Amino acid sequence: AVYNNTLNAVESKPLLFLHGILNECRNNFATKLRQDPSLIVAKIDQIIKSQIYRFWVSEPYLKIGRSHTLYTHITPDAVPQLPKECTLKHLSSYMEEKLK
Amino acid sequence: NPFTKIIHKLKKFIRYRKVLRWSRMWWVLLVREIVGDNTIEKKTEKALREIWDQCTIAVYNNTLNAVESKPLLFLHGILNECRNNFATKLRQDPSLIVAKIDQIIKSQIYRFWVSEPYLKIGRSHTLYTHITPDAVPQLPKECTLKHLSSYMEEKLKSMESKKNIESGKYEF
Amino acid sequence: DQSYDPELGARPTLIFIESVIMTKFAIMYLKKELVDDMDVFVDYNSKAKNLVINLS
Amino acid sequence: LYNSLSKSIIGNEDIIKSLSDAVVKAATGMKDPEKPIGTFLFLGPTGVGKTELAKTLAIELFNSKDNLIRVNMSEFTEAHSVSKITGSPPGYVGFSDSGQLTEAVREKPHSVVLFDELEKAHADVFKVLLQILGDGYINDNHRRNIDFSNTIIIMTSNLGAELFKKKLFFDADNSGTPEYKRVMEDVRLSLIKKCKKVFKPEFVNRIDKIGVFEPLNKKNLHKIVALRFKKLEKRLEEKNIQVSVSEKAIDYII
Amino acid sequence: SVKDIKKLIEEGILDYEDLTENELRKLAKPDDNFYELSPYASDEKDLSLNETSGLTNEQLKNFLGQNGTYHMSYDSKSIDYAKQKKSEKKEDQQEDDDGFYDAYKQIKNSYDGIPNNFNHEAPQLIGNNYVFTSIYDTKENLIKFLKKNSEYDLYD
Amino acid sequence: SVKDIKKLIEEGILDYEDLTENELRKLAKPDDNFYELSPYASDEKDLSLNETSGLTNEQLKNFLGQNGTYHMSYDSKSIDYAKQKKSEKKEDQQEDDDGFYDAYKQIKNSYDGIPNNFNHEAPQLIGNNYVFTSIYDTKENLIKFLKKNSEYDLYD
Numbered sequence: 077a078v079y080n081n082t083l084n085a086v087e088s089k090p091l092l093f094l095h096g097i098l099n100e101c102r103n104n105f106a107t108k109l110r111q112d113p114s115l116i117v118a119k120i121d122q123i124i125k126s127q128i129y130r131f132w133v134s135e136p137y138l139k140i141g142r143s144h145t146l147y148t149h150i151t152p153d154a155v156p157q158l159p160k161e162c163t164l165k166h167l168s169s170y171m172e173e174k175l176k
Numbered sequence: 177n178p179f180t181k182i183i184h185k186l187k188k189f190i191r192y193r194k195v196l197r198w199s200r201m202w203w204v205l206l207v208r209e210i211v212g213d214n215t216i217e218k219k220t221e222k223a224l225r226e227i228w229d230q231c232t233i234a235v236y237n238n239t240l241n242a243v244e245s246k247p248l249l250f251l252h253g254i255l256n257e258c259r260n261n262f263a264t265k266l267r268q269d270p271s272l273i274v275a276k277i278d279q280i281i282k283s284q285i286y287r288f289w290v291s292e293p294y295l296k297i298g299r300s301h302t303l304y305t306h307i308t309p310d311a312v313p314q315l316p317k318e319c320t321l322k323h324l325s326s327y328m329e330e331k332l333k334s335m336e337s338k339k340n341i342e343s344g345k346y347e348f
Numbered sequence: 349d350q351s352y353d354p355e356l357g358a359r360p361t362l363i364f365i366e367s368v369i370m371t372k373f374a375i376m377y378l379k380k381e382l383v384d385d386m387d388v389f390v391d392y393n394s395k396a397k398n399l400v401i402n403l404s
Numbered sequence: 405l406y407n408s409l410s411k412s413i414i415g416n417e418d419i420i421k422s423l424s425d426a427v428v429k430a431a432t433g434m435k436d437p438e439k440p441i442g443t444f445l446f447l448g449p450t451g452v453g454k455t456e457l458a459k460t461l462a463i464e465l466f467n468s469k470d471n472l473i474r475v476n477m478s479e480f481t482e483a484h485s486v487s488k489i490t491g492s493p494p495g496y497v498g499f500s501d502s503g504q505l506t507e508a509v510r511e512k513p514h515s516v517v518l519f520d521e522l523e524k525a526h527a528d529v530f531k532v533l534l535q536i537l538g539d540g541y542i543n544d545n546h547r548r549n550i551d552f553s554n555t556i557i558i559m560t561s562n563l564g565a566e567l568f569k570k571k572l573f574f575d576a577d578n579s580g581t582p583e584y585k586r587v588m589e590d591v592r593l594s595l596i597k598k599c600k601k602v603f604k605p606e607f608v609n610r611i612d613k614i615g616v617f618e619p620l621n622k623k624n625l626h627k628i629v630a631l632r633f634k635k636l637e638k639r640l641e642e643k644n645i646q647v648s649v650s651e652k653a654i655d656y657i658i
Numbered sequence: 659s660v661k662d663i664k665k666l667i668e669e670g671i672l673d674y675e676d677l678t679e680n681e682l683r684k685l686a687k688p689d690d691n692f693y694e695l696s697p698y699a700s701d702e703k704d705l706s707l708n709e710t711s712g713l714t715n716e717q718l719k720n721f722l723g724q725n726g727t728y729h730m731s732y733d734s735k736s737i738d739y740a741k742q743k744k745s746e747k748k749e750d751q752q753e754d755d756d757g758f759y760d761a762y763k764q765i766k767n768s769y770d771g772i773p774n775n776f777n778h779e780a781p782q783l784i785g786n787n788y789v790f791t792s793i794y795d796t797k798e799n800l801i802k803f804l805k806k807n808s809e810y811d812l813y814d
Numbered sequence: 815s816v817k818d819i820k821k822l823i824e825e826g827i828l829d830y831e832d833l834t835e836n837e838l839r840k841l842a843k844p845d846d847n848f849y850e851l852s853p854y855a856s857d858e859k860d861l862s863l864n865e866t867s868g869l870t871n872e873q874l875k876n877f878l879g880q881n882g883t884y885h886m887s888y889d890s891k892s893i894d895y896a897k898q899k900k901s902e903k904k905e906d907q908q909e910d911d912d913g914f915y916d917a918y919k920q921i922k923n924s925y926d927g928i929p930n931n932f933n934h935e936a937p938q939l940i941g942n943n944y945v946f947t948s949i950y951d952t953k954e955n956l957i958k959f960l961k962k963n964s965e966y967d968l969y970d
């Protein structure tokens with residue numbers, strides 16, 4: 077739904093799509109998922125609201141998206157892990173430390 | 177379903193062949209104004225050219241005036257038709273297509289799309305098919321939104337920054 | 349140029365005169381760096397900055 | 405006076421610098437004969453000591469709570485209520501008093517004029533306020549001038565609930581200079597921008613210093629409470645009360 | 659040897675590696691506050707349920723599945739309805755955040771296997787066995803122990 | 815030789831052509847403010863999402879595709895609904911906000927590959943490699959360098 081709305085290329089300007097795709101599924105999950113025990117709408121709210129999705133586009137991560145791999149070949153092993161200071165779990169822990 | 181696809185591709189050629197000369201030309205300029213020297217997608221032009229063609233089909237059925245006789249009436253008609261046709265279809269605009277066509281109407285920089293280099297293509301006998309981005313000469317820099325936008329930095333943030341003070345940081 | 353705003357009608361230009369320049373004239377009068385008979389010659393330093401050259 | 409206000413009130417010393425220097429201009433010949441000295445617009449989040457400054461200036465600059473003149477703007481929410489400020493015009497009910505606020509300034513020209521919460525009033529009440537911050541040429545029903553020279557016109561109003569400072573300081577850090585300083589001014593600009601939205605920007609030009617108060621958290625709140633116990637030391641001794649605080653005694657409260 | 663005393667000695671003298679199997683089992687079981695009756699819960703503003711949610715359309719899902727060169731996926735009626743009612747009956751009651759703090763507390767609880775208003779002790783499977791944690795005692799130093807050291811070998 | 819110092823020398827002495835490959839690579843990477851945690855965002859009035867948008871009708875799209883000598887393309891219900899709800903309270907503010915400065919700032923950010931409320935450093939592909947720019951440091955003199963000089967040859 078987002079790539080039919082963008083004249084810009086995906087490789088040319090990648091974060092425009094992260095703001096477009098995550099907000100599309102911030103609402104697409106909200107209109108479909110009634111109960112979130114794993115808080116899927118709630119966490120995508122805070123990835124938008126805290127802008128820590130900028131680490132999903134980085135120098136280790138721009139190498140996979142440029143490379144010629146079909147999307148079926150992409151596994152969780154091919155994507156390298158974010159550092160712990162970048163993830164939401166340490167962001168949510170460091171927040172509760174500061175506010176409490 | 178492929179047969180019905182063929183005739184309704186033909187029905188934009190038997191009729192509507194004069195507008196799509198001016199339509200595809202005003203779309204090649206519009207993709208340059210929306211994107212502005214970044215790689216455009218060759219595949220989802222086709223999703224958005226069909227919506228732009230349906231804007232010009234909808235305007236040319238509403239005008240008794242000829243397109244060659246009074247061309248800017250159509251730019252006010254077509255761009256406002258796809259200022260709303262994109263708004264009712266495109267939910268997320270990462271490239272801000274509704275937002276930029278808002279400012280082309282409100283700042284009236286679409287008068288450069290109808291000029292002496294540009295009126296020669298629309299009068300000439302070229303099928304819409306043959307109108308490519310190479311056929312469309314580029315606007316000067318002053319007429320891209322970029323320059324205009326950048327000119328709205330300079331104005332506002334020279335004065336937005338002169339909004340208020342630290343009131344005592346200023347020493348002598 | 350530090351307080352140009354025509355939409356507010358150039359009252360912030362005079363507030364900036366009163367809240368900055370006149371306040372330094374009031375603070376430096378209480379402490380005795382300004383004698384009652386002193387001529388004041390304000391000039392800009394062209395060093396990012398304001399200075400007032402006191403004269404007698 | 406800059407040191408004494410930093411005692412009872414802690415945060416937002418840049419507002420105090422704009423506040424104390426207006427007294428410094430009044431104490432010397434740097435006086436504006438038309439404009440009332442010390443007009444302020446105290447926007448900020450709910451809970452901080454905004455109206456408390458008007459109490460401290462009455463206790464310090466005027467040695468009495470009598471020079472504090474509260475204006476309960478909750479009484480003045482109606483559009484008809486604006487006559488209660490300036491009194492009833494001639495030929496109507498009343499007219500013997502010149503008004504609620506306008507009579508009381510006449511006997512004490514050297515006094516602060518507190519306005520409590522400007523967020524809840526009709527805009528007709530703001531129309532009289534244009535002259536109030538502008539000049540001392542305020543006429544009664546008998547049309548005599550009232551001397552608002554030497555009156556410090558403190559005007560708190562919240563708007564705390566609405567947005568900017570409403571966004572809770574995300575990082576409750578004391579002051580990150582590259583962060584807090586930048587983001588606060590962006591919200592303060594918005595606060596000023598909002599005023600054009602409602603306070604009718606003619607009124608904004610009459611303001612000498614809009615001051616946004618910084619919202620309290622654990623770093624600031626840790627420092628406040630010991631002075632509240634020192635307020636219990638001064639008032640409640642002679643009958644002999646002298647409290648003391650600890651590391652745990654403040655952490656238990658926060 | 660008792661459940662309560664060992665965690666007072668974890669800071670002082672002894673580490674986590676030298677505990678008994680029956681001591682690691684006891685320290686992962688819930689405390690005595692579990693089984694003690696307390697029928698009261700508060701702040702029923704949970705981020706688990708979405709009030710904007712609706713049924714599967716089964717005609718839109720048919721249309722979105724055929725890839726249809728479309729421009730929007732979701733329905734956007736109930737999520738604009740919640741935006742409108744927030745601006746009208748909310749602007750009287752003025753703005754509220756609910757993210758300055760109530761969001762990040764409930765997100766961190768969902769990483770520990772704890773529901774959002776749940777004030778009691780909650781299990782989460784670490785390796786082969788369960789560890790009962792709560793909001794109050796997060797048992798984070800045990801989770802570091804039973805993930806790192808219990809990769810290859812077994813503990814109960 | 816350090817990322818921060820070279821841009822202080824670009825105005826003074828040295829140009830952009832004489833930098834090292836490892837210096838051009840370092841100057842296009844993000845600064846140290848990237849990776850530094852800051853969970854603060856504001857002004858959630860973005861021009862990216864359109865509140866007037868709706869689903870594909872699939873009967874109108876069938877009707878508009880057959881060229882049908884029609885007179886209007888879009889649906890015009892939700893875009894007259896947004897016009898009506900805008901007129902409800904005369905707009906004292908916004909008759910001339912939100913049609914001005916906030917529009918042109920977010921348009922210029924979309925030419926740099928930056929989202930609308932995004933206060934951090936954002937990539938954009940220039941030639942063969944990426945350049946991380948933000949609102950604050952636009953890196954415009956690098957984009958002039960890696961477009962003009964890097965037409966024919968390769969730099970990393």
Ligand SMILES: Nc1ncnc2c1ncn2[C@@H]1O[C@H](COP(=O)(O)OP(=O)(O)OP(O)(O)=S)[C@@H](O)[C@H]1O
Pocket residue numbers: 412413414415448449450451452453454455456560562564628
């Ligand atoms: N910076 C501060 N210095 C000293 N006392 C403070 C400060 N901030 C808050 N307080 C105390 O907290 C209370 C603040 O009262 P106020 O907030 O001024 O009343 P108020 O201003 O009408 O509140 P709002 O924001 O309008 S709901 C008083 O008890 C003060 O003593």
